[PDB]
Amino acid sequence: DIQTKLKWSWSTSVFHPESNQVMAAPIVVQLNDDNGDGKIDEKDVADIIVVTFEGNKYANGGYIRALSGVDGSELWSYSNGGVIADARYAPAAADLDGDGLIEIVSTSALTPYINILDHQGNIKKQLLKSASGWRSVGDIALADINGDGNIEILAADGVYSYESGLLFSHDWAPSSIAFDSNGDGQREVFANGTLYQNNGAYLWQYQANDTVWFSSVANLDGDDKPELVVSVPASLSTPENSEIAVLEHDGSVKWRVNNLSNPGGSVQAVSSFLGKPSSSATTVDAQSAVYGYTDWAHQQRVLAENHQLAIRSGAVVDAIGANSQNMIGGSGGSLSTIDTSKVRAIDVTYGKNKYTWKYGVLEMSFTLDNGAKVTVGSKDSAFTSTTVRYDIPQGSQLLGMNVWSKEKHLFKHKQQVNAVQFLVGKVTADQSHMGIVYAGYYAVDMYDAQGNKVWSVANDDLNSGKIGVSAYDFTGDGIDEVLVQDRLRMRILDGQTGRVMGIIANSSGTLWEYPVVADLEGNNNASLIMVANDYDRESQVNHGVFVYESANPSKPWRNATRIWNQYAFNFSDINANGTIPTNAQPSWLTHNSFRSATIRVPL
Ligand SMILES: [Ca+2]
Ligand SMILES: [Ca+2]
Ligand code: NA
Ligand code: NA
Ligand code: NA
Ligand code: NA
Ligand code: NA
């Protein structure tokens, strides 16, 4: 079990003491100079931003409050009278203008502007919204979607430039995200089932039975392309309209589920829940014999990159490498490539070269899984030769080669491959460790990448059907646990089985908030942050913000993000200091997670 103890809590204020309920996910960013060095950066203690409301008035706006990561004390003076934001959606934060200080982006149905606050809670910029009222209120995500160095704001009624304001309008969407769907370097915008180019041009639209709420991007199959996970919560009286679905980059359905035994669901977390990322990796575990002549040559290992090997060859096999720039062998021959994932056998011809009278590899003939043959070199180069076949074992793939090439007393343009050896390994599904988890009206359900349900854990959310989840590796074994919330309890669930590993009393009427793990101090021992409200008789335990830490000093919560800057958090769109990258590498090819706090190194 995971043992916890309270780090601090916030439940009251001298500024509007009646506004003390919270029902939107917390945000974590640096807002003050804790160490007194005149700067605000990752050396300080990250802070919490929430929106508070009074009683049951969560639909009528609330106050943005900044809470110190150290002790929960309020960092702001509210000398401006406070800033109203919608209390149902978390704001978003980042250093938008590059001055080293965090800005906070939010809006409400009561203002015609997107309000951008400085780190002290005072208005800094305003952008006139496309829509008014409830149609202009939803999630906000921050990204540089066209790579021009300026940050775009993805809001409920359109996409905005921090500098120039509204770029294009769209119908109300509770959720928007950006990702490069087609590999052209530009990020498209996905909102309420519609994929737009970043100028607003329509690309495609997933036809659903009700509003499409939050989405995740991840790699859930065997290619380098992104997949999209989407939730349609519908309502408890129209459960036939709810679903969870995985879409391909072109909008086609990979799989979808309508589950009448657990309808609803507005948001998911996607992460390494079913195993460690390494448990899905294909590694070398066997090899062929050595074919050819090893005298006066040093064995050098060549592993295939992107399941490809490069080969230069003419009359004979001259050089082999992972790519054309890092090749073992002589300088001659023309260039070809081999798709190693398709190779099922290789015939190697080695012997005395009739042109030079040297001994080496004269030809290799690859048999592919479709029966086609790819050859390099030529058997006709032999004065004498031997031909041998190596079969790739069933269930294994060709992963690389050991290559011998003699240099002594040879011109570089006459050096060649003198011996070869094939390296193979057992094949495994590239995403067998990945899971998709979400909460419905009745339970938290975990799915594998193919749409098979792995487990279901009863979780009372009859009042909403949209409650959120997040992910974090509390135990430190490389596999994320699931963080869940219902009317009365926050719980930690085992990723592989759903077993309950921790329970914390924490009440909420529930909307779509989730708990957050973040390493506030940066010393590799994280904090667990959750919001609470007690206005409803069926969820009357506590109210405010409650922050926990590991109760066992020999069990620190390691490798947690220093920052959780928006509701659609997935690392790749934020740096630790709060700046936003101009061209971030694709999340689905690095940590391949969404709404996980766990810092992961790719591959
Ligand atoms: Ca400082
Ligand atoms: Ca701080
Ligand atoms: Na800034
Ligand atoms: Na931009
Ligand atoms: Na694109
Ligand atoms: Na993919
Ligand atoms: Na774990």
CA distance 560 to 548: 14
SS3 361: strand
Please check if 426 is assigned to a binding site.
Answer: no
Breaks (C-N over 2.5 A) in the chain follow: none
Is 473 annotated among the ligand-binding residues?
A: no
- Cα 9 to middle of ligand 3, angstroms: 28
CA distance 203 to 366: 41
Measure CA of the first residue to CA of the last residue in the chain; give whole Å: 29
| Distance between CA atoms of residues 133 and 396, nearest Å | 59
* CA distance readout (Å), 337 to 48, 362, 376: 52, 17, 10
Q: How far is CA 111 from the centre of its chain?
A: 33
Distance (Å, rounded) from C-alpha 376 to C-alpha 499? 55
Residue where the block lists tokens 């659609």:
568
Q: Do residues 276 and 429 make contact, with C-beta atoms less than 8 angstroms apart?
A: no
DSSP state of 512: S
| Displacement of CA 557 from its chain's centroid (Å) | 20
CA of 41 from ligand 2 middle (Å) equals: 9
Dump the DSSP string for 265-331.
Answer: ---EEEEE-SS-GGGG-----EE---EE--TT---EEEE-BTTEEEEEESSSEEEEESSTTSEEE-S
Nearest by Cα to 437 from 301, 577, 262, 303: 262
Give the residue among 290, 272, 292, 268 at the shortest CA–CA distance from 281. 272
* Experimental approach taken: X-ray
DSSP for 405-445, written as a single string: ---TT--GGG----EEEEEEEE---TTTTEEEEEE-SSEEE
Question: Are the CB atoms for 444 and 482 separated by under 8 Å?
Answer: yes
The SS3 call for residue 83 is: coil
Q: Which amino acid is at 275?
A: G
Q: Count CB-CB contacts under 10 A for residue 224.
A: 11
Q: 455: which 2 tokens?
A: 């487990």
Total residue length of the chain: 603
Distance CA 218, CA 587 (A): 7
Cα–Cα distance for residue pair 65/12, rounded to 1 Å: 11
Nearest 5°: the CA angle 158, 162, 164 is 80
The letter for the amino acid at 22 is: V
Measured in Å, residue 94 CA sits from the centre of ligand 2 at 15
Could you count the other beta carbons within 10 Å of the beta carbon of residue 553? Answer: 8
CB 72 within 8 A of CB 61: no
Query: What's the rounded Cα separation, in Å, for the pair 279 and 180?
Result: 28
Does 519 appear as a known binding residue? Answer: no
CA 14, 543, 513, 499 dihedral sign is: positive
**Bridge partner residues of 457 (DSSP):** 444
Q: Which amino acid is at 531?
A: V
Resolution (angstroms) stands at 1.9
306 is in an annotated binding site: no
Sign of CA dihedral 453, 270, 184, 197: positive
374 is in an annotated binding site: no
Amino acid at 594: F
Other Cβ atoms closer than 10 A to 547: 22
C-alpha distances out from residue 119 to 31, 75, 95, 197, 291, Å: 5, 10, 10, 32, 67
How many Å lie between the centroid of ligand 1 and the Cα of residue 577? 11
* CB-CB neighbours of 373 under 10 Å: 10
Q: What is the 3-state secondary structure (H, E, C) of 216-245?
A: EEECCCCCCCCEEEEEECCCCCCHHHCEEE
CA distance 481 to 474: 7
The residues, any chain, with a CB within 8 Å of residue 124's CB and separated by 6 or more, are: 103, 116, 117, 118
Query: How far apart are the C-alpha atoms of 51 and 394, rounded to whole Å?
Result: 58
45 is in an annotated binding site: yes
* CA–CA dist 573, 579 (Å, integer): 9
Token pair 């990258």 is found at 581
Residue 19 CB neighbours (<10 A)? 21
596 forms bridges with which residues in the sheet?
Answer: 471
Q: What is the rounded CA–CA span in Å between residue 288 and residue 300?
A: 15
Looking at the CA of 474, name the nearest ligand: 7
221 is known to lie in a ligand binding site: no
The letter for the amino acid at 513 is: E
Q: How far is the CA of 43 from the centre of ligand 1 (A)?
A: 6
Q: 52 C-alpha vs ligand 2 centroid, how far in Å?
A: 19
- Amino acid 11 reads S
